[PDB]
Amino acid sequence: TTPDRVHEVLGRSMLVDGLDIVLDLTRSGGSYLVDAITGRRYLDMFTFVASSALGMNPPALVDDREFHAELMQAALNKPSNSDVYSVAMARFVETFARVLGDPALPHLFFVEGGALAVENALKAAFDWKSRHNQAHGIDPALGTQVLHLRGAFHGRSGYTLSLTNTKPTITARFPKFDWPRIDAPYMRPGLDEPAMAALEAEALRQARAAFETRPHDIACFVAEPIQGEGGDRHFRPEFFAAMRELCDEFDALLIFDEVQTGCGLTGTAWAYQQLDVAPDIVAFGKKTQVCGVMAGRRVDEVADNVFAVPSRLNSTWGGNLTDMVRARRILEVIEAEGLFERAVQHGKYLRARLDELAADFPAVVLDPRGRGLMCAFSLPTTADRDELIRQLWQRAVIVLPAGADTVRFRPPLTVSTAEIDAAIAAVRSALPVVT
Amino acid sequence: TTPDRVHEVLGRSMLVDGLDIVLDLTRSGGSYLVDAITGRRYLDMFTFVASSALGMNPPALVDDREFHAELMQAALNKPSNSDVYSVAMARFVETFARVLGDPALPHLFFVEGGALAVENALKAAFDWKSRHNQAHGIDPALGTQVLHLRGAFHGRSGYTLSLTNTKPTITARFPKFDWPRIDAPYMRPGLDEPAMAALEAEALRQARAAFETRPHDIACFVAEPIQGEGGDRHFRPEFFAAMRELCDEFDALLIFDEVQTGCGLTGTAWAYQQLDVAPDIVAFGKKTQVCGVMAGRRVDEVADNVFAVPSRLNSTWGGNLTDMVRARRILEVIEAEGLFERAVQHGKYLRARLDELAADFPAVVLDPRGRGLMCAFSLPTTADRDELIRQLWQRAVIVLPAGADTVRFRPPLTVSTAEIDAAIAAVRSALPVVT
Numbered sequence: 001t002t003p004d005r006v007h008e009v010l011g012r013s014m015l016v017d018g019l020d021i022v023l024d025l026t027r028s029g030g031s032y033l034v035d036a037i038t039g040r041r042y043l044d045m046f047t048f049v050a051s052s053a054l055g056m057n058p059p060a061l062v063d064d065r066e067f068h069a070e071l072m073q074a075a076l077n078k079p080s081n082s083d084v085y086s087v088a089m090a091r092f093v094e095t096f097a098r099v100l101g102d103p104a105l106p107h108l109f110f111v112e113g114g115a116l117a118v119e120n121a122l123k124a125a126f127d128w129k130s131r132h133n134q135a136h137g138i139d140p141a142l143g144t145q146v147l148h149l150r151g152a153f154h155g156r157s158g159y160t161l162s163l164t165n166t167k168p169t170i171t172a173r174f175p176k177f178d179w180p181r182i183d184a185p186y187m188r189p190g191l192d193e194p195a196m197a198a199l200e201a202e203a204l205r206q207a208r209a210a211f212e213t214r215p216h217d218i219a220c221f222v223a224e225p226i227q228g229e230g231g232d233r234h235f236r237p238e239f240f241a242a243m244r245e246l247c248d249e250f251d252a253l254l255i256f257d258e259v260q261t262g263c264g265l266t267g268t269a270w271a272y273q274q275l276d277v278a279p280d281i282v283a284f285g286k287k288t289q290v291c292g293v294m295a296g297r298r299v300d301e302v303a304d305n306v307f308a309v310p311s312r313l314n315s316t317w318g319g320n321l322t323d324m325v326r327a328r329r330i331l332e333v334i335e336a337e338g339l340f341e342r343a344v345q346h347g348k349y350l351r352a353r354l355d356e357l358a359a360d361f362p363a364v365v366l367d368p369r370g371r372g373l374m375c376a377f378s379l380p381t382t383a384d385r386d387e388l389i390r391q392l393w394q395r396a397v398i399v400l401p402a403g404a405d406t407v408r409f410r411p412p413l414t415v416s417t418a419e420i421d422a423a424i425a426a427v428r429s430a431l432p433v434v435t
Numbered sequence: 436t437t438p439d440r441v442h443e444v445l446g447r448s449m450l451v452d453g454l455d456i457v458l459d460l461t462r463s464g465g466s467y468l469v470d471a472i473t474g475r476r477y478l479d480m481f482t483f484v485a486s487s488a489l490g491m492n493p494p495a496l497v498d499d500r501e502f503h504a505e506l507m508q509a510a511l512n513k514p515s516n517s518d519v520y521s522v523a524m525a526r527f528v529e530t531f532a533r534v535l536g537d538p539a540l541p542h543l544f545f546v547e548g549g550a551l552a553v554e555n556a557l558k559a560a561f562d563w564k565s566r567h568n569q570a571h572g573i574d575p576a577l578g579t580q581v582l583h584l585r586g587a588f589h590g591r592s593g594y595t596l597s598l599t600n601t602k603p604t605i606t607a608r609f610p611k612f613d614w615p616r617i618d619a620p621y622m623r624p625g626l627d628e629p630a631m632a633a634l635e636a637e638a639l640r641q642a643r644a645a646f647e648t649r650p651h652d653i654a655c656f657v658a659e660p661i662q663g664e665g666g667d668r669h670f671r672p673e674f675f676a677a678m679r680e681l682c683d684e685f686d687a688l689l690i691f692d693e694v695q696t697g698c699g700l701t702g703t704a705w706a707y708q709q710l711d712v713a714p715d716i717v718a719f720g721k722k723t724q725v726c727g728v729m730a731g732r733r734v735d736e737v738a739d740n741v742f743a744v745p746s747r748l749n750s751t752w753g754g755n756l757t758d759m760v761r762a763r764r765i766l767e768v769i770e771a772e773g774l775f776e777r778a779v780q781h782g783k784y785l786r787a788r789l790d791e792l793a794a795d796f797p798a799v800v801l802d803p804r805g806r807g808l809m810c811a812f813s814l815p816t817t818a819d820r821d822e823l824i825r826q827l828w829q830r831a832v833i834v835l836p837a838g839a840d841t842v843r844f845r846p847p848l849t850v851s852t853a854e855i856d857a858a859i860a861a862v863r864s865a866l867p868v869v870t
């Protein structure tokens with residue numbers, strides 16, 4: 001079966017709503033996807049929805065003959081890492097701890113899938129709250145609710161469908177828990193310190209009210225440090241620092257969902273490191289290839305927590321061993337080539353270019369924003385946003401929509417300034433056409 | 436980091452409650468796991484909890500130099516198959532359809548993880564019921580409950596934690612929906628046709644009562660065709676045929692969870708093919724490597740179902756491309772070497788040997804049972820069962836517990852009769868020690 005027949009074959013069995021190209025697995029490389037049908041090269045600011053750190057076929061992986069042998073050994077089989085340990089697995093875990101570890105969060109747990117990473121973070125919190133309640137003479141039936149934000153996206157699974165609230169298409173007609181949801185006080189243009197502080201104060205009031213009206217029943221607060229799917233909405237560190245204090249006052253865990261922000265994109269291992277707020281638990285995925293949680297801080301105060309008691313958390317495989325081997329090589333490249341720092345520098349460059357765009361097109365390029373390489377801007381209407389994405393597609397630049405009017409950039413950490421310039425050049429060409 | 440240091444390294448970050456061995460990825464093969472620490476070979480009747488169809492490093496995979504190149508191409512990267520299609524993906528899908536497909540169930544959907552496969556089956560049913568309700572003048576807020584069995588295991592995720600009911604450790608302190616649960620009328624020794632029929636009639640009465648007391652609100656009935664984790668509990672085809680009629684009478688979908696039974700273990704592609712009951716949806720995983728659902732039958736009667744409307748179901752990756760490439764090669768081996776038929780024949784052999792054991796040890800080897808290679812027996816007490824597993828471990832045979840008193844066999848489809856004899860020889864040696 002042939003590149004020009006891929007869509008026909010898949011269309012017999014599935015809804016085929018993805019891209020019109022067929023990925024060439026061999027010829028794609030770095031910031032470029034190759035369409036196997038035409039041979040056209042596409043500039044990639046999409047990176048499999050922000051899940052590729054180094055882009056396609058990175059040289060450090062492709063040229064490493066020893067790694068080839070390690071990867072092949074892992075790829076031929078699929079052990080249940082839950083039950084059966086290997087050297088390949090242990091090397092991944094120690095390098096994950098070294099490169100991305102936080103000394104306050106020593107407990108690691110791996111699983112396949114971002115939604116399930118978040119769910120295990122939730123399960124840790126539910127167990128923790130119930131046991132903390134029990135230890136202090138409170139009914140252990142209490143501790144089952146999750147405080148969360150409007151505009152959140154945490155996944156499409158049983159628990160995360162009660163949290164995710166972006167597009168109705170995602171959650172409509174699926175049963176949900178009635179969990180408390182508060183306004184998201186994200187930064188918007190033309191609001192100064194005082195106006196921001198007032199916005200935050202109102203979310204915080206809603207948060208406090210939830211805690212007081214559902215006593216001992218809220219196990220945790222979950223947030224994305226920067227909301228991705230909801231529209232690259234950024235929050236001041238002050239908001240989360242206040243939430244941190246409020247969580248502690250009501251004995252609730254703070255969980256950061258770093259599935260989209262994590263693994264270097266904002267310029268640090270984790271976005272929370274720049275906000276200077278310490279979470280009790282972090283859910284990770286996408287760029288990490290294997291998904292999972294890191295936990296500690298207050299979690300350890302309950303001695304029989306989910307990380308200390310056998311069989312409270314599990315899955316058949318405990319993550320994909322092939323993903324672990326690939327991820328450990330990727331982490332070694334990040335560490336050796338200083339890619340977090342490269343993301344800070346190139347992220348400053350991308351951001352500066354978006355600021356220039358805003359100046360040249362004041363009524364059209366709205367709210368340029370970003371942290372590291374996680375950058376975005378918005379258009380006046382969703383029709384404009386949609387049209388700009390199509391115009392870029394015609395020019396062989398792949399970017400992603402978010403929310404109602406946002407265009408987001410998700411370049412690989414290895415993107416060059418010339419590649420950023422090419423993406424920006426395409427946007428400048430397309431904009432007069434959309435206006 | 437060295438085989439003898441694997442447990443120490445992992446133990447700094449995780450609960451290390453798995454096996455005392457370290458898997459040698461290279462030297463393991465067929466029905467044998469190799470401990471990298473000692474070089475001792477272990478007879479494998481566990482197969483990464485029934486997730487390996489051909490065992491370790493099968494020759495058809497290891498010796499195939501063209502497949503090596505295809506696997507390597509897939510393993511180096513991890514595309515989002517949700518968005519970006521490839522030839523590798525299309526070849527997997529057409530071979531899955533050819534080898535395991537059912538002409539009544541043409542809609543395929545893939546995802547990482549068995550619990551999420553079941554959840555997507557549930558989501559399809561919730562959407563279907565709500566839309567079917569709406570189309571017939573019934574409130575579309577109705578259709579949110581799942582009828583299911585006692586002793587069921589469907590996963591450890593948000594929706595499946597409301598269904599799974601085996602050991603309290605799995606579900607305790609996690610929030611749940613109040614979904615209707617009925618007795619499981621499984622076959623037990625010393626019950627004849629009439630007594631079985633009475634048992635079934637009572638479950639069916641409970642099922643009917645649930646439907647009548649929760650009108651238009653039960654979207655589906657979910658079952659394992661043979662309950663695995665709950666204790667290899669088998670059901671007569673009559674029970675499911677009656678459930679099939681009852682589902683149709685109340686406009687509810689029937690879903691079979693074949694994550695553990697599927698992909699040839701019982702001697703057919705799917706266990707439901709031997710029960711002669713047509714499901715509307717099948718959840719699969721484990722041996723398939725990639726997980727997912729097949730759907731059709733009544734699903735198609737709602738034209739805007741979840742398989743026809745973009746973005747109702749999704750994940751970042753849409754399954755792991757490396758798993759798809761491996762699975763397609765495994766399916767080709769199954770088809771070429773007649774491994775379903777080999778499972779029927781060797782399954783009859785294993786079963787006959789367990790019958791012999793029951794005769795030689797009448798008060799100790801209870802209820803020998805099986806379908807194909809999915810076989811089991813029970814012991815008088817859980818202390819006896821636990822001790823037998825330890826005694827087998829000392830003799831380098833790996834088997835799994837289930838329920839309170841069951842020992843289950845999960846050999847690879849490629850197991851030989853000499854390997855079955857070796858496992859049986861070990862059980863005969865260990866039994867006098869446990870008594």
Ligand SMILES: Cc1ncc(COP(=O)(O)O)c(C[NH2+]CCCC[C@H](N)C(=O)O)c1O
Pocket residue numbers: 049113114115116118153154155156224228229257258259260261285286749750751752
């Ligand atoms: C912030 C955040 N949390 C969890 C997830 C879920 O990850 P996974 O898809 O289950 O592996 C995500 C995923 N976000 C977007 C990429 C996939 C496409 C799209 N979100 C979808 O509609 O499913 C996340 O960003």
Ligand SMILES: Cc1ncc(COP(=O)(O)O)c(C[NH2+]CCCC[C@H](N)C(=O)O)c1O
Pocket residue numbers: 314315316317484548549550551553588589590591659663664692693694695696720721
């Ligand atoms: C019948 C059945 N349905 C769903 C699942 C869930 O699959 P996954 O683990 O999410 O990939 C299973 C899995 N059953 C057992 C193997 C793993 C160990 C154990 N069940 C556990 O405690 O998690 C299944 O059998």
